[PDB]
């Protein structure tokens, strides 16, 4: 299970799934929806999975928690044009997560 050490990085992840424009990157982008993504995106990340992951034990550092994150604003703006709605999102995600981690770091 996740280390005590890593609490703020549960908080921020928290923090990030609870803001408005995180609603892109809940789950994982989801077929249903859109064709052809993962033949693109070779690693996809998202929220719920960091969540389980880190929950779990699966980040030994904060350093691996912050590169999954930094991967769902890469592969958001890999995939999406800067104007639409969910590379808007993006960016506005990738803003909010710098700003918070750089209260630590
Ligand atoms: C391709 C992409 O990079 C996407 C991300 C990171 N996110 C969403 C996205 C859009 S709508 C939505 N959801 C609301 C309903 N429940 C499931 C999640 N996710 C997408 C696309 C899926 C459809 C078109 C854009
Ligand atoms: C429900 C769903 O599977 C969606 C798809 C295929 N696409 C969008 C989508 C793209 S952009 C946009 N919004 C702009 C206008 N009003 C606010 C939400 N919704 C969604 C929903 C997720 C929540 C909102 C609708």
Known sequence: SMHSDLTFCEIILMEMESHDA?????????????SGYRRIIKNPMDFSTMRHRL?????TSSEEFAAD???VFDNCQ??????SEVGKAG???????????????
């Open 22 to 34: 995180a609603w892109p990157f809940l789950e994982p982008v989801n077929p249903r929806l859109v």
């Open 91 to 105: 960016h506005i995600m990738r803003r909010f997560f710098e700003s918070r981690w750089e209260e630590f770091y």
């Open 78 to 83: 890999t995939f999406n044009e800067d104007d």
């Open 55 to 59: 929950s779990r034990g699966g980040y």
């Open 69 to 71: 994150a930094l991967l």
